[PDB]
Amino acid sequence: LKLLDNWDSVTSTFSKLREQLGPVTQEFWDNLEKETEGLRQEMSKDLEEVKAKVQPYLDDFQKKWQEEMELYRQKVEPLRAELQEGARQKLHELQEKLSPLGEEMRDRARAHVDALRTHLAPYSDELRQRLAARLEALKENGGARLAEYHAKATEHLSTLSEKAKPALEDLRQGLLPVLESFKVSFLSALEEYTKKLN
Amino acid sequence: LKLLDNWDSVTSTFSKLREQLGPVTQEFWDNLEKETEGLRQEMSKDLEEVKAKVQPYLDDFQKKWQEEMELYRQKVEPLRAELQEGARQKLHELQEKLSPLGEEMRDRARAHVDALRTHLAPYSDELRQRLAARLEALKENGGARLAEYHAKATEHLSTLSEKAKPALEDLRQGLLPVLESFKVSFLSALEEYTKKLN
Ligand SMILES: CCCCCCCC/C=C\CCCCCCCC(=O)OC[C@H](COP(=O)(O)OCC[N+](C)(C)C)OC(=O)CCCCCCC/C=C\CCCCCCCC
Ligand SMILES: CCCCCCCC/C=C\CCCCCCCC(=O)OC[C@H](COP(=O)(O)OCC[N+](C)(C)C)OC(=O)CCCCCCC/C=C\CCCCCCCC
Ligand SMILES: CCCCCCCC/C=C\CCCCCCCC(=O)OC[C@H](COP(=O)(O)OCC[N+](C)(C)C)OC(=O)CCCCCCC/C=C\CCCCCCCC
Ligand SMILES: CCCCCCCC/C=C\CCCCCCCC(=O)OC[C@H](COP(=O)(O)OCC[N+](C)(C)C)OC(=O)CCCCCCC/C=C\CCCCCCCC
Ligand SMILES: CCCCCCCC/C=C\CCCCCCCC(=O)OC[C@H](COP(=O)(O)OCC[N+](C)(C)C)OC(=O)CCCCCCC/C=C\CCCCCCCC
Ligand SMILES: CCCCCCCC/C=C\CCCCCCCC(=O)OC[C@H](COP(=O)(O)OCC[N+](C)(C)C)OC(=O)CCCCCCC/C=C\CCCCCCCC
Ligand SMILES: CCCCCCCC/C=C\CCCCCCCC(=O)OC[C@H](COP(=O)(O)OCC[N+](C)(C)C)OC(=O)CCCCCCC/C=C\CCCCCCCC
Ligand SMILES: CCCCCCCC/C=C\CCCCCCCC(=O)OC[C@H](COP(=O)(O)OCC[N+](C)(C)C)OC(=O)CCCCCCC/C=C\CCCCCCCC
Ligand SMILES: CCCCCCCC/C=C\CCCCCCCC(=O)OC[C@H](COP(=O)(O)OCC[N+](C)(C)C)OC(=O)CCCCCCC/C=C\CCCCCCCC
Ligand SMILES: CCCCCCCC/C=C\CCCCCCCC(=O)OC[C@H](COP(=O)(O)OC[C@H](N)C(=O)O)OC(=O)CCCCCCC/C=C\CCCCCCCC
Ligand SMILES: CCCCCCCC/C=C\CCCCCCCC(=O)OC[C@H](COP(=O)(O)OC[C@H](N)C(=O)O)OC(=O)CCCCCCC/C=C\CCCCCCCC
């Protein structure tokens, strides 16, 4: 009955609020009407004058924009002409280098890579020797390491059997009564919660 | 209660671990010896050959570095001159643009700003006329709203006190017996809980 009576206090509040919301909206709408009414009178000024002035405003900016566009176009032509001539000259100077210095770079690259090839050839040969030596050393040792690891694993497993058998059985032998004692507490605890929560 | 039994089992596993550690580390060290010495067989040749590899490699790289460095002297240096003249030309091209177009942009700015002067000032003044009416409406509706809010405040306060009294009465009149009931449930709960956690 707690929530039932408490809800009544909430319901009455809603009723009181609803009876107040009426006048609230009535007066608020009334005040809003004056607000919008004023804004309407203002709209007949704001938009009216902004439209009456939008003509000379836009025409002014447009006129000047046209001048700006004309001036820009009157400049863009000779400017592009200068840029084009300059570009041709500058690009030509670049071509005067891309060709000789380009071939020079290619010719030097020939030597660069040729020396590299003549270096990589014996290098890789010796690298193969290194790999052969390293892999073989790691192989002979690898087999021993694997054999040793097998022994270590064998000893690990045999000792693990001291855990998988005795220790595990011991744990189970402990778990059994542990679970039983836990069952006792769990059973009573469940009764406890149920006795108080219901 | 049987933690001693479990702990002993853990102790046994620790001893078994040590029984492993001894032999395992012994052969592991023997393994490490094979690894260290084995790796040394590789490392000796590796390091010795590294000397016979890095020396002619740095030399080869230095040769290429010279070709590249000297190459850059016959490329970057003259190109710096080509680009210098090109930049100077471009700067001249730009200077002959930033001056006329620069003052032109300023003239445009003058025409736009002066326009904005007679476009923003008069408009803001008209906006002042509008804002005055807007604020006047807001002040009127605000004055009314202040009264409405004041009235509604008293109406809401009366409904609040009209609720607070009986609500607090019923709430306390509910809390009093409910607390006693809660105490009973809590006392029985605690009393029995300590019995299970005994
Ligand atoms: C059937 C279903 C029923 C439904 C349930 C309804 C029943 C609920 C019943 C009662 C609720 C009322 C709450 C208790 C009344 C508060 C009394 C009060 O005024 O108590 C203030 C104390 C703070 O101590 P003090 O400094 O005043 O005292 C030390 C004084 N010496 C240092 C200053 C001098 O507070 C305390 O006792 C309270 C604990 C500490 C308060 C810390 C402040 C917490 C603030 C905000 C938490 C907001 C979480 C929201 C964020 C979520 C984001 C997602
Ligand atoms: C239909 C169902 C609808 C849903 C229901 C909604 C729930 C509403 C009901 C209950 C809410 C539970 C909260 C009650 C807690 C008490 C608040 C209060 O009363 O605490 C008074 C104190 C006085 O200050 P002190 O230094 O002595 O206390 C400092 C003391 N210590 C440090 C312990 C805190 O205040 C403070 O602690 C800090 C507060 C400062 C307040 C300044 C007021 C400024 C004026 C106007 C702000 C307008 C807000 C508009 C929102 C409308 C609200 C109706
Ligand atoms: C201390 C005393 C404090 C005084 C407190 C004042 C309380 C008055 C305020 C609010 C009344 C709360 C009413 C709650 C009752 C439940 C109504 C209901 O049956 O609720 C459920 C419905 C439907 O579920 P749903 O649509 O939410 O879920 C959508 C999710 N799906 C689709 C999965 C279903 O929810 C809906 O109908 C959505 C309802 C959202 C409407 C909230 C009320 C907004 C009121 C005013 C807005 C302000 C206008 C002013 C601005 C004008 C400036 C000129
Ligand atoms: C939420 C927490 C965030 C808080 C941050 C913001 C606070 C700052 C305060 C206010 C700024 C809010 C402005 C954004 C306006 C909301 C727009 C919106 O998201 O709206 C949604 C509503 C809901 O409906 P709907 O979208 O489902 O339907 C339309 C769809 N259809 C086609 C499907 C059926 O749309 C409607 O109610 C329909 C609208 C009908 C338009 C009528 C226009 C009448 C003309 C003039 C009125 C005069 C105003 C005077 C100026 C006074 C300024 C003080
Ligand atoms: C007294 C009262 C006066 C005060 C007024 C002052 C303000 C007036 C200013 C702007 C209002 C615009 C008026 C609406 C009228 C038309 C709108 C419209 O439709 O005009 C169409 C245009 C063009 O479109 P079109 O390609 O079809 O025509 C191009 C076709 N030709 C090339 C192919 C041939 O469009 C446009 O002018 C669209 C430009 C606007 C861009 C909107 C997209 C926004 C995108 C994302 C929202 C991001 C929010 C970011 C938040 C972060 C903030 C930090
Ligand atoms: C951990 C052992 C302790 C070592 C110490 C004692 C030594 C014992 C003696 C010898 C060791 C023998 C080594 C054998 C281990 C190889 C494991 C392996 O080959 O694994 C990779 C496999 C790959 O998957 P798949 O090809 O079989 O499946 C694909 C299935 N499809 C395609 C078929 C359907 O995965 C599997 O077999 C999944 C097996 C998941 C194993 C989870 C073990 C988590 C234990 C500890 C993590 C934390 C260590 C940090 C301790 C910090 C202490 C401070
Ligand atoms: C002293 C200590 C001892 C010494 C130790 C060092 C030993 C290391 C040994 C050899 C180095 C080679 C490493 C990379 C292995 C792959 C070699 C190979 O078979 O590669 C083939 C690729 C394929 O290219 P494609 O022309 O057939 O395909 C063009 C296709 N389409 C046109 C559709 C775009 O060739 C490429 O990625 C390269 C061609 C693209 C050129 C890119 C620019 C590179 C910049 C500077 C030259 C750097 C030389 C340094 C070596 C690194 C090479 C990546
Ligand atoms: C001892 C050895 C010395 C090494 C010296 C090397 C530098 C000396 C300079 C020049 C001569 C060597 C030339 C090597 C450069 C050419 C790389 C190349 O063959 O490029 C071709 C790619 C093709 O693109 P795609 O659209 O046809 O393929 C997209 C189509 N799909 C997706 C199907 C594949 O790119 C293009 O053609 C676009 C070209 C963009 C330019 C890339 C140049 C990158 C080089 C260096 C910048 C590094 C900055 C790192 C900073 C660290 C400093 C320590
Ligand atoms: C239905 C509508 C009716 C109106 C309801 C009025 C009745 C009150 C009823 C219930 C309580 C509502 C809950 C208030 C919310 C708690 C806010 C809070 O947690 O507040 C304390 C915190 C703590 O920081 P602090 O105090 O050290 O810093 C203050 C900094 N200070 C000096 C620099 C400016 O403050 C902050 O987070 C900083 C924010 C402080 C803002 C103060 C606002 C001052 C404005 C006007 C004062 C008007 C009083 C007239 C009352 C009108 C009755 C009709
Ligand atoms: C860590 C990230 C680095 C990224 C850098 C990106 C920027 C690239 C832009 C321009 C190229 C670099 C242009 C470098 C110009 C050198 C500028 C210079 O004087 O630098 C000095 C510093 C010294 O630092 P310290 O901390 O040692 O001492 C600071 C000192 N006390 C102080 O108060 O300043 O040394 C340095 O950091 C610079 C080392 C220069 C050695 C190599 C000089 C290069 C010479 C020739 C070029 C040959 C090109 C070879 C490459 C071809 C391809 C294979
Ligand atoms: C009457 C029965 C009713 C039944 C109740 C059933 C439910 C019980 C469950 C929850 C209710 C308890 C709710 C307790 C809420 C505690 C709220 C609180 O103030 O917490 C703070 C403490 C802080 O401890 P620390 O004090 O040691 O502080 C030092 C801190 N680092 C510093 O620099 O200052 O944090 C801690 O409590 C944790 C560390 C505690 C250290 C001591 C830990 C000591 C723990 C146990 C005691 C020894 C066991 C003896 C055997 C008896 C059992 C048979």
From Swiss-Prot, chains A, B:
Keywords, comma-separated and alphabetical: Amyloid, Amyloidosis, Atherosclerosis, Cholesterol metabolism, Disease variant, Glycation, Glycoprotein, HDL, Lipid metabolism, Lipid transport, Lipoprotein, Neuropathy, Oxidation, Palmitate, Phosphoprotein, Repeat, Secreted, Signal, Steroid metabolism, Sterol metabolism, Transport
Keyword S-adenosyl-L-methionine assigned: no
Gene Ontology cellular-component annotations: blood microparticle; chylomicron; collagen-containing extracellular matrix; cytoplasmic vesicle; cytosol; early endosome; endocytic vesicle; endocytic vesicle lumen
Repeat region (Sequence), residues: 1-22, 23-44, 45-55, 56-77, 78-99, 100-121, 122-143, 144-165, 166-176, 177-198
Mutagenesis / variant outcome for changing residue 60 to N: In Munster-3A
Disease: Hypoalphalipoproteinemia, primary, 2: An autosomal recessive disorder of lipoprotein metabolism, biochemically characterized by severe apoA-I deficiency and severely reduced serum high-density lipoprotein cholesterol (HDL-C). Affected individuals have undetectable serum levels of apoA-I, and develop xanthomas and corneal opacities. The disease is generally associated with atherosclerosis and markedly increased cardiovascular risk. Hypoalphalipoproteinemia, primary, 2, intermediate: An autosomal dominant disorder of lipoprotein metabolism, biochemically characterized by partial apoA-I deficiency and reduced serum high-density lipoprotein cholesterol (HDL-C). Affected individuals have half the normal plasma apoA-I and HDL-C levels, and may develop xanthomas and corneal opacities. Most patients do not have increased cardiovascular risk.
Subunit comment: Homodimer. Interacts with NAXE and CLU. Component of a sperm activating protein complex (SPAP), consisting of APOA1, an immunoglobulin heavy chain, an immunoglobulin light chain and albumin. Interacts with NDRG1. Interacts with SCGB3A2. Interacts with NAXE and YJEFN3.
Protein name: Apolipoprotein A-I
Source organism (scientific name): Homo sapiens (Human)
Full-protein residues shown: 68 to 265 of 267
